[PDB]
Design an enzyme around this catalytic site. Structure first.
Site, PDB file in Angstrom:
ATOM      1  N   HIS A  40       0.723  -1.105   0.009  1.00  0.00           N
ATOM      2  CA  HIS A  40       0.045   0.110   0.058  1.00  0.00           C
ATOM      3  C   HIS A  40       0.909   1.178  -0.001  1.00  0.00           C
ATOM      4  O   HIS A  40       0.354   2.476  -0.057  1.00  0.00           O
ATOM      5  CB  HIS A  40      -1.053  -0.235   1.168  1.00  0.00           C
ATOM      6  CG  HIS A  40      -0.490   0.335   2.442  1.00  0.00           C
ATOM      7  ND1 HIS A  40      -0.171  -0.292   3.436  1.00  0.00           N
ATOM      8  CD2 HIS A  40      -0.303   1.799   2.912  1.00  0.00           C
ATOM      9  CE1 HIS A  40       0.059   0.282   4.640  1.00  0.00           C
ATOM     10  NE2 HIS A  40       0.266   1.398   4.396  1.00  0.00           N
ATOM     11  N   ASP A  84       0.017  -7.577   1.863  1.00  0.00           N
ATOM     12  CA  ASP A  84       0.428  -6.143   1.780  1.00  0.00           C
ATOM     13  C   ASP A  84       1.945  -6.044   1.717  1.00  0.00           C
ATOM     14  O   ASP A  84       2.580  -5.611   2.826  1.00  0.00           O
ATOM     15  CB  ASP A  84      -0.118  -5.270   2.746  1.00  0.00           C
ATOM     16  CG  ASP A  84      -0.042  -3.766   2.902  1.00  0.00           C
ATOM     17  OD1 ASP A  84       0.474  -3.148   1.626  1.00  0.00           O
ATOM     18  OD2 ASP A  84      -0.014  -2.752   3.934  1.00  0.00           O
ATOM     19  N   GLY A 174       2.621   6.783   8.782  1.00  0.00           N
ATOM     20  CA  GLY A 174       3.965   6.840   8.403  1.00  0.00           C
ATOM     21  C   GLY A 174       4.917   5.925   8.898  1.00  0.00           C
ATOM     22  O   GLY A 174       5.973   6.045   8.561  1.00  0.00           O
ATOM     23  N   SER A 176       4.036   2.688   8.316  1.00  0.00           N
ATOM     24  CA  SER A 176       3.592   1.744   7.284  1.00  0.00           C
ATOM     25  C   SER A 176       4.841   1.177   6.424  1.00  0.00           C
ATOM     26  O   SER A 176       5.517   2.034   5.764  1.00  0.00           O
ATOM     27  CB  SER A 176       2.549   2.217   6.333  1.00  0.00           C
ATOM     28  OG  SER A 176       1.221   2.416   7.068  1.00  0.00           O
ATOM     29  N   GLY A 177       4.934  -0.038   6.163  1.00  0.00           N
ATOM     30  CA  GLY A 177       6.039  -0.695   5.327  1.00  0.00           C
ATOM     31  C   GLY A 177       7.169  -0.762   6.324  1.00  0.00           C
ATOM     32  O   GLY A 177       8.070  -1.672   5.620  1.00  0.00           O
TER      33      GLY A 177
END
Ligand SMILES: [Ca+2]
Length: 222
Positions: A40, A84, A174, A176-177
């Site tokens: 995402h 994801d 923020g 994320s990932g």
């Protein structure tokens, strides 16, 4: 990261910042040429920033490397934020050193109750933590049953929950990932949740261990 603490600088040397004019997502270096992040967080080109602690200050430890390939998992789905996971190929290899070191992919799927670390430069929902400095938080893996109970029917085989159902401690926008490391391996990717650090709404992470064949086959190409 909500309810955490400032990481010891460079204690998470796989942590990268994905930048498109500004930080917008985290990721993890897994070898000198590749980063794992969240689908995402996809943009067709990004700058990977390695060797960071304070993303606002030039510390002398940084490497900034453009991506050459950004590869979403083929079966990513936004209904559920399923699968994801994304691979980023670096346009030139990272130099591995004191400040930049890859994290290992999982040798197993970590069991419920394993204590892990999540890190990032996301929102801290705190009057005293500074999201400009990499934040760290210890979170345990919750059971599938508690995870599904929190978000009925939305938790797939490619997800796990981690954190505290009482709230107050969580990853957030923020982050994320970015990584979830358990016993020194990349077990999770920061993926989604309802709000941040809300009671009954634990963080949800992509479950890296069931992606190893996709990850290594994809990285085997050049
Ligand atoms: Ca910096």
């Amino acid at each position: 990261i909500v309810g955490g603490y400032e990481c010891k600088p460079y204690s998470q040397p796989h942590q990268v910042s994905l930048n498109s004019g500004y930080h917008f997502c985290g990721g993890s270096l897994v070898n000198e040429n590749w980063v794992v992040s969240a689908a995402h967080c996809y943009k067709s080109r990004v700058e990977v920033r390695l060797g960071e602690h304070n993303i606002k200050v030039t510390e002398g430890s940084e490497q900034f490397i453009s991506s050459s390939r950004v590869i979403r998992h083929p079966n990513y789905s936004s209904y559920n934020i399923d699968n994801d996971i994304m691979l980023i190929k670096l346009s030139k290899p990272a130099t591995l050193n004191t400040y930049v070191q890859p994290v290992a992919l999982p040798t197993s799927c970590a069991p419920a109750g394993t204590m892990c670390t999540v890190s990032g430069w996301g929102n801290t929902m705190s009057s005293t933590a500074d999201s400009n400095k990499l934040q760290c938080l210890n979170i345990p893996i919750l059971s599938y049953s508690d995870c599904n109970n929190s978000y009925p029917g939305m938790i797939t085989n490619a997800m796990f929950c981690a954190g505290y159902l009482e709230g107050g401690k969580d990853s957030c926008q923020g982050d994320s990932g970015g990584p979830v490391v358990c016993n020194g391996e990349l077990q999770g990717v920061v993926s989604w949740g309802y709000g941040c650090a809300e009671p009954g709404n634990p963080g949800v992470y992509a479950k890296v261990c069931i992606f190893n064949d996709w990850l290594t086959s994809t990285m085997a190409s050049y």
